[PDB]
Amino acid sequence: FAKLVRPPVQIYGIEGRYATALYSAASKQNKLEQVEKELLRVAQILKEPKVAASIMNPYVKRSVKVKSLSDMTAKEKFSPLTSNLINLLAENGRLSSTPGVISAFSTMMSVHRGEVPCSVTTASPLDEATLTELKTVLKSFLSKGQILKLEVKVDPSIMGGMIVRIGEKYVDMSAKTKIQKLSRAMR
Amino acid sequence: KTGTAEVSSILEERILGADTSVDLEETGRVLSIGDGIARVHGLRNVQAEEMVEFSSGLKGMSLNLEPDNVGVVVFGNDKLIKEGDIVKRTGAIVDVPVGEELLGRVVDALGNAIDGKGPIGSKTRRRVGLKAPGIIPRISVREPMQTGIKAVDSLVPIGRGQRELIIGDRQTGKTSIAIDTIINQKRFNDGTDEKKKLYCIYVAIGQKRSTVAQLVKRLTDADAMKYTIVVSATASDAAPLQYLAPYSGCSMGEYFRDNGKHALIIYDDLSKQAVAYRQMSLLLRRPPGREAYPGDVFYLHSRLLERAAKMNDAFGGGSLTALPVIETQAGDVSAYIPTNVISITDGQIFLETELFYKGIRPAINVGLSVSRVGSAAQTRAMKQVAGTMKLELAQYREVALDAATQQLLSRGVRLTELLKQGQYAPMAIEEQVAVIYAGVRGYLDKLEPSKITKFENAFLSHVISQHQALLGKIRADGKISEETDAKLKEIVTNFLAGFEA
Amino acid sequence: GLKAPGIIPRISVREPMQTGIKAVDSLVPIGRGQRELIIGDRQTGKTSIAIDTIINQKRFNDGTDEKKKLYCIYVAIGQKRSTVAQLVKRLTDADAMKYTIVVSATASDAAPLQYLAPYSGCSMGEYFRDNGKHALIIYDDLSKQAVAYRQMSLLLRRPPGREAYPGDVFYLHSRLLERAAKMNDAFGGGSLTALPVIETQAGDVSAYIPTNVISITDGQIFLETELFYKGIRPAINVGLSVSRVGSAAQTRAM
Amino acid sequence: TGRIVAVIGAVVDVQFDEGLPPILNALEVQGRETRLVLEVAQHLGESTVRTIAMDGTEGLVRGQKVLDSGAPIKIPVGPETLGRIMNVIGEPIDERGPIKTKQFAAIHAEAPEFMEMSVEQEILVTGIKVVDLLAPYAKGGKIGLFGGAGVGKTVLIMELINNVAKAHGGYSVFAGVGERTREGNDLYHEMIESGVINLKDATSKVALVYGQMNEPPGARARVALTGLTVAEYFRDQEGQDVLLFIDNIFRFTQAGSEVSALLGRIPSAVGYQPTLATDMGTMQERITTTKKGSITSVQAIYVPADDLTDPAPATTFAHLDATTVLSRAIAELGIYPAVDPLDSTSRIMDPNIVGSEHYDVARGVQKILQDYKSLQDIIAILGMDELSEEDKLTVSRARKIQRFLSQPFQVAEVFTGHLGKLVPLKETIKGFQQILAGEYDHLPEQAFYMVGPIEEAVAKADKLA
Numbered sequence A: 001f002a003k004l005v006r007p008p009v010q011i012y013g014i015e016g017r018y019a020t021a022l023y024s025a026a027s028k029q030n031k032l033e034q035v036e037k038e039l040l041r042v043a044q045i046l047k048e049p050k051v052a053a054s055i056m057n058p059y060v061k062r063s064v065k066v067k068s069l070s071d072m073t074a075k076e077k078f079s080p081l082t083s084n085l086i087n088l089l090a091e092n093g094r095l096s097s098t099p100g101v102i103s104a105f106s107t108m109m110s111v112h113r114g115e116v117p118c119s120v121t122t123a124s125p126l127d128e129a130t131l132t133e134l135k136t137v138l139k140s141f142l143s144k145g146q147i148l149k150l151e152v153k154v155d156p157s158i159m160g161g162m163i164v165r166i167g168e169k170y171v172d173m174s175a176k177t178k179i180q181k182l183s184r185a186m187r
Numbered sequence B: 001k002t003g004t005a006e007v008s009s010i011l012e013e014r015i016l017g018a019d020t021s022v023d024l025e026e027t028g029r030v031l032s033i034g035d036g037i038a039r040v041h042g043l044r045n046v047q048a049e050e051m052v053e054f055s056s057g058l059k060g061m062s063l064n065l066e067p068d069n070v071g072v073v074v075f076g077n078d079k080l081i082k083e084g085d086i087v088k089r090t091g092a093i094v095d096v097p098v099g100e101e102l103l104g105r106v107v108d109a110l111g112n113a114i115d116g117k118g119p120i121g122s123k124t125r126r127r128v129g130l131k132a133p134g135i136i137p138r139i140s141v142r143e144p145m146q147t148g149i150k151a152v153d154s155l156v157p158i159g160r161g162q163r164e165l166i167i168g169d170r171q172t173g174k175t176s177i178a179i180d181t182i183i184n185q186k187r188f189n190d191g192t193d194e195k196k197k198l199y200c201i202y203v204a205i206g207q208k209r210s211t212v213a214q215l216v217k218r219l220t221d222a223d224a225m226k227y228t229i230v231v232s233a234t235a236s237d238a239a240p241l242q243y244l245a246p247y248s249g250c251s252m253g254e255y256f257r258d259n260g261k262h263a264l265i266i267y268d269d270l271s272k273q274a275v276a277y278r279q280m281s282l283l284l285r286r287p288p289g290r291e292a293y294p295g296d297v298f299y300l301h302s303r304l305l306e307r308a309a310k311m312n313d314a315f316g317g318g319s320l321t322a323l324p325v326i327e328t329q330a331g332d333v334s335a336y337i338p339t340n341v342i343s344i345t346d347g348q349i350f351l352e353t354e355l356f357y358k359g360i361r362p363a364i365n366v367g368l369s370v371s372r373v374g375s376a377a378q379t380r381a382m383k384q385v386a387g388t389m390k391l392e393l394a395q396y397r398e399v400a401l402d403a404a405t406q407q408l409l410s411r412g413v414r415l416t417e418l419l420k421q422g423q424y425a426p427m428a429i430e431e432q433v434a435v436i437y438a439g440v441r442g443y444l445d446k447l448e449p450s451k452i453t454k455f456e457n458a459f460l461s462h463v464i465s466q467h468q469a470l471l472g473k474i475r476a477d478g479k480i481s482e483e484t485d486a487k488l489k490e491i492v493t494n495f496l497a498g499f500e501a
Numbered sequence C: 001g002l003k004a005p006g007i008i009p010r011i012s013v014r015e016p017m018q019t020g021i022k023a024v025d026s027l028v029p030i031g032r033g034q035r036e037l038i039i040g041d042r043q044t045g046k047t048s049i050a051i052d053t054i055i056n057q058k059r060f061n062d063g064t065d066e067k068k069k070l071y072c073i074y075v076a077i078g079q080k081r082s083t084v085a086q087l088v089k090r091l092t093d094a095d096a097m098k099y100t101i102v103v104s105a106t107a108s109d110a111a112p113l114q115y116l117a118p119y120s121g122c123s124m125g126e127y128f129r130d131n132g133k134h135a136l137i138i139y140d141d142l143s144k145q146a147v148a149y150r151q152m153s154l155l156l157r158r159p160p161g162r163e164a165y166p167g168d169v170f171y172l173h174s175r176l177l178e179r180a181a182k183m184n185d186a187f188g189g190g191s192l193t194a195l196p197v198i199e200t201q202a203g204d205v206s207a208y209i210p211t212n213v214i215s216i217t218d219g220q221i222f223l224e225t226e227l228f229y230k231g232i233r234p235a236i237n238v239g240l241s242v243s244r245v246g247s248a249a250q251t252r253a254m
Numbered sequence D: 001t002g003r004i005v006a007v008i009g010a011v012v013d014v015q016f017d018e019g020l021p022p023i024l025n026a027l028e029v030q031g032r033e034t035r036l037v038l039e040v041a042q043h044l045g046e047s048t049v050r051t052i053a054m055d056g057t058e059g060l061v062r063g064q065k066v067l068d069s070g071a072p073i074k075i076p077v078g079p080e081t082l083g084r085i086m087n088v089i090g091e092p093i094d095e096r097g098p099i100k101t102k103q104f105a106a107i108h109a110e111a112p113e114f115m116e117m118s119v120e121q122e123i124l125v126t127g128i129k130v131v132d133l134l135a136p137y138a139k140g141g142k143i144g145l146f147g148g149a150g151v152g153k154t155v156l157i158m159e160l161i162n163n164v165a166k167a168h169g170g171y172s173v174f175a176g177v178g179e180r181t182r183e184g185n186d187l188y189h190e191m192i193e194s195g196v197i198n199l200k201d202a203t204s205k206v207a208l209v210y211g212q213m214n215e216p217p218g219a220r221a222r223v224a225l226t227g228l229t230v231a232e233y234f235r236d237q238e239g240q241d242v243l244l245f246i247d248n249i250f251r252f253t254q255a256g257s258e259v260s261a262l263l264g265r266i267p268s269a270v271g272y273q274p275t276l277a278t279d280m281g282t283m284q285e286r287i288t289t290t291k292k293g294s295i296t297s298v299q300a301i302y303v304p305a306d307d308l309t310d311p312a313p314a315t316t317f318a319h320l321d322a323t324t325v326l327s328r329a330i331a332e333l334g335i336y337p338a339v340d341p342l343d344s345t346s347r348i349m350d351p352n353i354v355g356s357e358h359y360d361v362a363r364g365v366q367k368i369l370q371d372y373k374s375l376q377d378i379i380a381i382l383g384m385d386e387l388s389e390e391d392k393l394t395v396s397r398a399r400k401i402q403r404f405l406s407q408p409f410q411v412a413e414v415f416t417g418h419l420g421k422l423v424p425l426k427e428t429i430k431g432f433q434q435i436l437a438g439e440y441d442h443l444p445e446q447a448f449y450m451v452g453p454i455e456e457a458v459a460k461a462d463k464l465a
């Protein structure tokens, strides 16, 4: 066999085996951005009631579900290596798991420029000066030249503090400083 | 549901264009290896039970065809194989070299020499997975196959085409019956009557390698390696090489049977084959049964011992005799394997481990040894005398100062000591019929029991010399007439007057 | 999770470990570094033999001779809380809870806490071996550790074996009993003595776990139930009890 | 290099990139204090191998780095390994400095071929009167030693080392398969105090391989292979007549059926592995007599639950050629060595192997020792004088024979004070050929206790009174 390039995330499952085998063929020949723009439009053209039907319907055949898809991917835009991918998903019966392969590929291609975003879950949204200060100290923490994305969630069960995660780091300044008052009891 | 060939090294061949410089019709790769079988991807024109060849030089059998892969049973060790190899398709069912030009060699189970005498020089190849002959071509046995042992040839007679078991515990004299059968054929293979010639095959399964080597000397010492083949898969060989050892051994005997010759094969032993088929079954995750055996152990030994048959006169007239060996654990003749083979073969020979300790050798249990179809095919000279000894060995067995008890307890011990025999001394047929004559006609009833092994070695050594031309009419005419037994009365009663007590 | 000492830091066992039972010290002696198995059925005085051996070392533990003191540890693996509360009071009455530690992983506590508790007692009995002192430990009992470990295996989907035990239950008990050693003078001269309790079922020692721990240790003390009701108390069978340090752990008088 | 993907117990899975190593290789984990050797056993596909560890597995992180030796486990071998102690991977474990030698050898090696075996049986002489007469030892065969502690077994080990290095000139290897640390320390110091190992010079006669009991179940199964590589050096390179001691063989079988169940395989009959007949095959066929030299093996055998037909003591029994049993009921009679003469068997005891002179002497000894065993019950129950005058000599002679089997050993010269005697073969056959015929019957019993040949027997009747 030949060797294959390793993705920087390395997820597992029956959907990770198809997002890795495409990443080992599109990192070769330098086509990692052409497939991504194609894959974000094949997600749109599957979820139509003419086409979402008779792909999960088990009583058609294997071969005529290929021919109804071998011309659909040929006429509109595509003749890359990715036309073999839809041809291979329909042979193995794995055409149902096609949103699983696409959604895995975006995060596998995200990490080529992405940052595994944060989670600040404290309270109601605050003023602008508090937001820009955390966005300009977390930029000092990545040290990788990548413009970090972030999400904010509202959870009032934390009393007055906030929890912050950077990837897989998870600092903590929250109501667990009230649970640290067992030193008055357990001593 | 994850698929064997859903791995990324095979999806990449498909997702990067359907590649042209891979064959995928006569050659394939190896995906995994280590439990015996290998998972070969490709090879889309392979047959079932077709021998393939690895890149290391190992043969392998195509056992199990699937829509993704092929499962190849590997002959020999599986250290030499690596994931990512390339396996070639031979194009033929598993077959072995066979012919007249093998008499005198020591091969392994695949048909390669391991005696260091160069190639074999064969021209024909027969398969190992052929079927037995049907109901029409067979016929009942009629020619006798001599053994040279005084306990076997007169109490459980064998015939050319009859299966016969040899069953006993360890170190009871199992192999030393099978060796004296091969040395006894020296008198027939070196003669002019071609209709009585008989070849031999020995199959050694799971034995030690240093016990086969001390066996081929003993055959060469007695001029018995010029009509004998030996197949050998010893205890250090892999498990598929012990499973396919009796099939390649029987396919070399099927050549002589279909071409008018008579053969003989000794499997030694079929116990260590069934513990080798157990290993390949449980390593394929099959449901075990009694004693953790697979469900088709009966198919293993029936499809092998059904080939040993005798063809009719319109098919050539040859034969094939088998003599398998089963080892029991402490006299257990009610276990799973020694009952699957009693219900196949046409009789038994029992070797007791508690008569081998008392000094009776060969320790043949005369009560439990039977031979059904081979009783009608024996010499009328032997049937005229051994039909009487069958009666007295029965009357000795019920009585185990009274009247009608101390008469049979006297004769019944002189016939037990008459049936002892030294190692590697195969007697002829017509020399047996004089020694069994003196023990059943009532001549040695007066002697002491300890001085009767001395008596047989003195009477035979002289009548072979001074009455040699008068003994040949027993073997030539094949019977004891009214002139021979009146002549035989004077030979013994003149020798007892000269035999110093 | 530490290891045993090797072959070089050990020395042969010579000092006596005094139990106080007239049948043990006469016929099946115990040295200071030997492993001796207390095997028998239910309700035959297996806990009581290992509870007066703790009481008997009071006569040395209040004196002056520093190289004759002994320290006892008792590990309860899967017993009810009321039984341990009765045994501490028995050792409080005899003034024998000022040199004894008790490690209790009871029946109500979780399945892995009955797995750590044998290995959480040797680590307290190796601090006395490392510092030139002497010690004693009692596992009560080891046949309830192989059961609390089997449950953890079959819920983690590991391949079973004989009586649904995993393939490494021999490796579970061997590396716990091999930590008992008689050190030499260059390392301190310490010691560690181990007495495991094993409950058989209907007197069949040929089971899985009664044959693992028999082949690891040195000798067994076999308490029968027939002799317990015939009047022989403590019901030690001296026909089947052995010790393979032999007579080299007895004093010259005994 | 490779990386570790899965750690489950004592089973590690390693992911490679280019250089996928074959089966039976040896890897080595980088970043740890002590050597941790992994042995490849299965190719799992997608460049992943299934390895069994050889030491503790904790502290291993998923995604470490693992090298490759490209060869199996290679041990230090040579003549300067005599007198040292090593584990299964060749490391020294007695703190006496690193072993230095010229060459190494691999432990996973094939059997000798068919054209190299010996074509004849040949008796090995060890000097002891009870062994070399009634249950003689074939050269190259496997020997089973029945008996355990308290019978005097570890002296018989230490004395067969000494006599072969005197009469034949061949050293020995001791392989402790899963043995206790407390009992593997006393055998170190019992050999020092008897001379067979020596801390001062190069006159040692053994090499110790000790794979002790608290080691992972993969490391207790390869010890009998490491201790057979060393024994193959003194035959393939120098041509000696080596001995080999395994103690015991049941802990080699039982340690095999815990690797084959950690690897996820369906068990065979009562609990063993599927491959019980090839692991006993691909070890004990390397113990043979080639054209250069030989290797003879004495193995201890423990029978579980007193079942002689259990598959662990039934696979082993097809390989042995002679069994000697140490009875404790002869040790309380005063005889040393405590070898039972009636319950020992030999396969090479045969008139076409050892000749007719050895045969009819050693046949009559076991027959006369049965008649005293049958007449000792009438004397104990009924009384003494009722039996005939022809039977009083058989009672007297059989108490001469069973004391003439005693022999003082050279390993016990310091303790019991006697002189150690090494008897050749032609004296032991000449001796018992005269005791049977009533030729030396008028001498008393204690002239025969603890002597060498028959010549020193009559020199001890003069000192009485």
Ligand SMILES: Nc1ncnc2c1ncn2[C@@H]1O[C@H](COP(=O)(O)OP(=O)(O)OP(=O)(O)O)[C@@H](O)[C@H]1O
Pocket (backbone or CB within 6 Å): B169, B170, B171, B172, B173, B174, B175, B176, B177, B361, B362, B421, B422, B423, D318, D347, D350
């Ligand atoms: N007729 C006989 N007279 C004297 N001795 C005999 C006779 N037959 C066999 N023996 C002895 O029995 C011994 C073992 O015989 P054999 O090799 O046939 O046993 P086996 O059952 O094949 O052993 P295993 O099957 O365990 O290899 C031989 O060494 C031989 O000396």
Ligand SMILES: Nc1ncnc2c1ncn2[C@@H]1O[C@H](COP(=O)(O)OP(=O)(O)OP(=O)(O)O)[C@@H](O)[C@H]1O
Pocket (backbone or CB within 6 Å): C041, C042, C043, C044, C045, C046, C047, C048, C049, C233, C234
């Ligand atoms: N030497 C003795 N003489 C008389 N009775 C005794 C003796 N030793 C113990 N007993 C009694 O035996 C009973 C049970 O003994 P013990 O609890 O020690 O047995 P055990 O087998 O360890 O218990 P378990 O089966 O719960 O582990 C106790 O009630 C105790 O009173």
Ligand SMILES: [Mg+2]
Pocket (backbone or CB within 6 Å): B174, B175
């Ligand atoms: Mg045999």
Ligand SMILES: [Mg+2]
Pocket (backbone or CB within 6 Å): C046, C047, C048
């Ligand atoms: Mg109790």
